[PDB]
Design an enzyme around this catalytic site. Structure first.
Site, PDB file in Angstrom:
ATOM      1  N   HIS A   1      32.049  39.134  35.330  1.00 28.94           N
ATOM      2  CA  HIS A   1      32.742  39.625  36.506  1.00 28.94           C
ATOM      3  C   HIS A   1      34.103  38.896  36.586  1.00 28.94           C
ATOM      4  O   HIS A   1      34.886  39.088  37.518  1.00 28.94           O
ATOM      5  CB  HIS A   1      31.904  39.396  37.770  1.00 28.94           C
ATOM      6  CG  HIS A   1      32.508  39.988  39.008  1.00 28.94           C
ATOM      7  ND1 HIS A   1      33.274  39.246  39.891  1.00 28.94           N
ATOM      8  CD2 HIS A   1      32.459  41.247  39.512  1.00 28.94           C
ATOM      9  CE1 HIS A   1      33.672  40.025  40.884  1.00 28.94           C
ATOM     10  NE2 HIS A   1      33.192  41.242  40.680  1.00 28.94           N
TER      11      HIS A   1
ATOM     12  N   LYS B   1      40.109  36.726  45.429  1.00 29.76           N
ATOM     13  CA  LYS B   1      39.133  35.667  45.693  1.00 29.76           C
ATOM     14  C   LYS B   1      39.847  34.317  45.681  1.00 29.76           C
ATOM     15  O   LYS B   1      40.259  33.813  44.632  1.00 29.76           O
ATOM     16  CB  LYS B   1      37.996  35.667  44.657  1.00 29.76           C
ATOM     17  CG  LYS B   1      37.181  36.976  44.571  1.00 29.76           C
ATOM     18  CD  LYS B   1      37.824  37.922  43.579  1.00 29.76           C
ATOM     19  CE  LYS B   1      37.025  39.211  43.368  1.00 29.76           C
ATOM     20  NZ  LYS B   1      36.527  39.727  44.656  1.00 29.76           N
TER      21      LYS B   1
ATOM     22  N   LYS C   1      37.887  38.359  35.107  1.00 27.50           N
ATOM     23  CA  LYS C   1      38.902  39.215  34.508  1.00 27.50           C
ATOM     24  C   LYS C   1      39.925  38.272  33.862  1.00 27.50           C
ATOM     25  O   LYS C   1      40.335  37.287  34.470  1.00 27.50           O
ATOM     26  CB  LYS C   1      39.572  40.112  35.569  1.00 27.50           C
ATOM     27  CG  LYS C   1      38.603  40.846  36.528  1.00 27.50           C
ATOM     28  CD  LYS C   1      38.140  39.937  37.693  1.00 27.50           C
ATOM     29  CE  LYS C   1      37.432  40.720  38.812  1.00 27.50           C
ATOM     30  NZ  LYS C   1      36.152  41.374  38.371  1.00 27.50           N
TER      31      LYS C   1
ATOM     32  N   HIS D   1      40.949  42.468  47.322  1.00 24.20           N
ATOM     33  CA  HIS D   1      40.132  42.090  46.163  1.00 24.20           C
ATOM     34  C   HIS D   1      40.289  40.626  45.739  1.00 24.20           C
ATOM     35  O   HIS D   1      39.419  40.079  45.057  1.00 24.20           O
ATOM     36  CB  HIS D   1      40.410  43.027  44.984  1.00 24.20           C
ATOM     37  CG  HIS D   1      39.328  43.016  43.958  1.00 24.20           C
ATOM     38  ND1 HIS D   1      39.538  42.610  42.656  1.00 24.20           N
ATOM     39  CD2 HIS D   1      38.009  43.309  44.055  1.00 24.20           C
ATOM     40  CE1 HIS D   1      38.395  42.657  41.995  1.00 24.20           C
ATOM     41  NE2 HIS D   1      37.451  43.069  42.824  1.00 24.20           N
TER      42      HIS D   1
HETATM   43  N1  LIG Z   1      27.673  45.617  44.340  1.00 23.33           N
HETATM   44  C1  LIG Z   1      28.772  45.648  45.303  1.00 23.33           C
HETATM   45  C2  LIG Z   1      29.816  46.688  44.887  1.00 23.33           C
HETATM   46  O1  LIG Z   1      30.443  47.050  46.131  1.00 23.33           O
HETATM   47  C3  LIG Z   1      30.815  45.974  43.956  1.00 23.33           C
HETATM   48  C4  LIG Z   1      30.963  46.300  42.607  1.00 23.33           C
HETATM   49  C5  LIG Z   1      31.887  45.581  41.830  1.00 23.33           C
HETATM   50  C6  LIG Z   1      32.651  44.541  42.382  1.00 23.33           C
HETATM   51  O2  LIG Z   1      33.545  43.827  41.654  1.00 23.33           O
HETATM   52  C7  LIG Z   1      32.485  44.216  43.714  1.00 23.33           C
HETATM   53  C8  LIG Z   1      31.574  44.933  44.482  1.00 23.33           C
END
Ligand SMILES: NC[C@@H](O)c1ccc(O)cc1
Ligand code: VO4
Length: 425
Positions: free
Chosen positions: A318, A104, A320, A102
């Protein structure tokens, strides 16, 4: 600007709100250095889109994609990448179930030195278009003169910590990056690295990762003085049958450590509906009814997304973040930007009678400690010495008719910004 904390550009807000903001194109531009090689750590990739974010002159330089995809998801990515001869992939071992890669992060090697970028965005068009995302930009790290004996290490141990983070992958292609980092001077770094890595951790090793890593750093590098804890995220794990199972027990304990009200900021259905994206913003806020129905208690902790300070109330988060504001919210004891959402998968859960920390995923963030700048606290910059908190304070409680955005149920009673409904299936 000691912080180097940035928001991504948002399309369709007034340009004043993008003045100090960055698009991936800006980060990769020749003004940031003469690119020679890069590594892109992420969860989701759109390779065609990504390659186009590099400036023409650099599109042919080597790029490593570091991902966690398995089976046919893996094959798809390799297919996306096969047309581009300069691209290699590194698959992060995910030995525990329900784990994700996860993190980045970008590693950017230049003729002039090295840059590290830690941020919250997937490498797909939509994560950089109309979302609130966060970015930490390292300074340009000079190469360590071929003549001398020096660690290139910082007071915050960032260099060693980043190497340890990369080392846990056990991956051949990262060793090359580990060796590039050894060669550079990272001593001017003023933030702390907080990583998560899949594993079961014991004794001293509990302190290396997750919310325990955070606890350790707040113990050693913060000091004491009813300061609330704020946590802000875009995805929500299964937290247990009530707050004592994990949230208020081990998670809050780590967060309140130094040398109490818990605010959680998560978009409501109304926030999502009237956003710039409308309901499709909800595709990036994956709270499922199955998880949500099991933990209805949590929702009394929930507060709306509001970001008038940065002009982004309509740009769904998106990013955090976690922080420790004073009781009047005018100052903070610390700030964390990270990829970690509100889950045990990400933060770690205590196993075998509190002797083991179990983490399922790779996560990475940077922690801003006032001690690293010689201070006791940061003042909050009220309008995006003083830390740029990107959303409004104090956080506003959900109304009585508000609900947490839940991705896999339909919203058909009211149309969104674009006159669309949402019927997942
Ligand atoms: N829309 C892609 C779905 O797999 C998703 C949903 C949330 C995220 O943080 C990352 C990816
Ligand atoms: O990429 V996920 O929050």
């Amino acid at each position: 600007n000691p912080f180097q904390f940035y928001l991504t550009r948002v399309s369709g807000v007034k340009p004043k709100y993008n003045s100090g903001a960055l698009h991936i194109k800006d980060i990769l531009s020749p003004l940031f250095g003469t690119l020679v090689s890069s590594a892109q750590f992420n969860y989701c990739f759109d390779v065609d889109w990504l390659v186009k974010q590099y400036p023409p002159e650099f599109r042919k330089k080597p790029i490593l994609l570091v991902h966690g995809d398995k089976r046919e998801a893996k094959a798809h990515l390799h297919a996306q990448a096969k047309p581009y001869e300069n691209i290699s992939l590194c698959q992060a071992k995910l030995d525990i179930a329900f784990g994700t890669h996860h993190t980045k992060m970008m590693l950017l090697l230049y003729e002039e030195g090295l840059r590290v970028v830690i941020h919250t965005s997937n490498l797909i068009h939509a994560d950089w278009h109309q979302k609130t995302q966060g970015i930490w930009l390292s300074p340009l790290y000079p190469r360590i003169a071929d003549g001398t004996h020096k660690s290139g290490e910082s007071p915050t141990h960032f260099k060693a910590n980043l190497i340890s983070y990369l080392t846990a992958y056990n991956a051949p292609s990262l060793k090359e990056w580990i060796d590039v980092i050894h060669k550079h001077d990272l001593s001017e770094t003023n933030v702390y690295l907080i990583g998560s890595t899949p594993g079961r951790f014991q004794g001293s090793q509990k302190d290396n990762w997750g919310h325990f890593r955070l606890k350790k750093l707040l113990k050693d590098h913060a000091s004491s003085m009813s300061w609330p804890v704020v946590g802000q995220f875009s995805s929500v794990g299964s937290l247990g049958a009530d707050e004592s199972k994990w949230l208020c027990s081990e998670f809050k304990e780590s967060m309140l450590t130094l040398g109490v009200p818990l605010y959680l900021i998560y978009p409501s259905v109304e926030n999502v509906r009237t956003s710039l994206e409308g309901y499709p913003a909800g595709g990036s806020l994956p709270y499922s009814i199955q998880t949500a129905e099991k933990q209805n208690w949590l929702h009394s902790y929930f507060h709306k997304w509001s970001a008038e300070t940065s002009g982004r109330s309509n740009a769904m988060p998106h990013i955090k973040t976690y922080m420790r504001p004073s009781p009047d919210f005018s100052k903070i004891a610390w700030f964390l930007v990270t990829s970690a959402n509100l889950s045990k998968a990400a933060w770690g859960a205590l196993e075998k009678n509190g002797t083991q920390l179990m983490i399922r995923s790779y996560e990475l963030g940077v922690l801003f400690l006032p001690s690293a700048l010689g201070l006791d606290s940061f003042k909050v910059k009220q309008k995006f010495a003083t830390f740029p908190v990107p959303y409004d304070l104090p956080p506003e409680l959900y109304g009585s008719k508000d609900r947490p955005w839940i991705w896999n149920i339909p919203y058909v009673k009211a149309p969104d910004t674009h006159g669309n409904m949402w019927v997942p299936s």
